[PDB]
């Protein structure tokens, strides 16, 4: 029942290979719905989920103007940050930004976010009060002063509490059949001998949405945290996600082991064992 919207911006310089690329994507939860790429043959905001397509040409042109302006703004920001760090004109650098709003199950604003990074390190973030900044170093302090002068925190607060929430709610309604539908994992346990005296038990979760899940193995009812090989949750490509967790167990202590599965889509949490 909890929902969020986020935009993710990536700006990458590439000296000797033209002007910096800017690409923006937008998400509601684990569903991407828009993209803009300054490298595209004809740069424009494009729909990436069916329920966004019903938005009119004024929506698309408003997004495109915003993202075109950002392309220019980030190119200057890249110049500026190069200078703040005394860096040579030879290397490629990346600024990233992620911002958006979280709603609780009642649809009210839980909190807002706006964070930026430079070469993958935290650079500047809006504090949870939506009024003040945390700057990582003396370079970021310069940005902080520029941002205070343009009343940025104030503008973000108005957006995060207003437009962000309102549009997130709109999308959740327009896309309710998917965005507000949790699909439970399909699960099973596999067994493969690794040797005479040990076997792998692998607990699979497939076809679930949203991506948040917990898979654990227990031996005699206690967690096997250090003994579990856990794979990153991965996209199937059809909106759903996949994950597995594995333990190497002594033969035949298999029945002492249980896989536990927690997901929003499930009527009740699952306990599974290998079923020979």
């Amino acid at each position: 029942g909890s929902h969020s919207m986020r935009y993710f911006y990536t700006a990458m310089s590439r000296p000797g290979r033209g002007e910096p690329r800017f690409i923006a994507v937008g998400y509601v939860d684990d569903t991407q719905f828009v993209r803009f790429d300054s490298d595209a043959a004809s740069p424009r905001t494009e729909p990436r989920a069916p329920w966004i397509e019903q938005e009119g040409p004024e929506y698309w042109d408003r997004n495109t103007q915003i993202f075109k302006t950002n392309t220019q703004t980030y190119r200057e920001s890249l110049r500026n940050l190069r200078g703040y760090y005394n860096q040579s004109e030879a290397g490629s650098h990346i600024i990233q930004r992620m911002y958006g709003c979280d709603l609780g199950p009642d649809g009210r604003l839980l909190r807002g976010h706006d964070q930026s990074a430079y070469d993958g390190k935290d650079y500047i973030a809006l504090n949870e009060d939506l009024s003040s900044w945390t700057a990582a170093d003396t370079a970021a302090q310069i940005t902080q002063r520029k941002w205070e002068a343009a009343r940025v925190a104030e503008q973000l607060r108005a957006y995060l509490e207003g437009l962000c929430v309102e549009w997130l709610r709109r999308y959740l309604e327009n896309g309710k059949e998917t965005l507000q539908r949790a699909d439970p994992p399909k699960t099973h346990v596999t067994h493969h001998p690794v040797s005479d005296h040990e076997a792998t038990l692998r607990c699979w979760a497939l076809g679930f949405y949203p991506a948040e899940i917990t898979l654990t193995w227990q031996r005699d009812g206690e967690d096997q945290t250090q003994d579990t090989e856990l794979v990153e949750t991965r996209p199937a490509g059809d909106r759903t996600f996949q994950k597995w967790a594995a333990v190497v167990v002594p033969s035949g202590e298999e029945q002492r082991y249980t896989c536990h599965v927690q997901h929003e889509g499930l009527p009740k949490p699952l306990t599974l064992r290998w079923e020979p």
Binding site: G26, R62, N63, T73, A150, L163, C164
Partner: peptide, 9 residues
């Protein structure tokens, strides 16, 4: 809908 103001860093 994205945030509408972009400010140089």
């Amino acid at each position: 809908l994205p945030f509408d103001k972009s400010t140089i860093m």
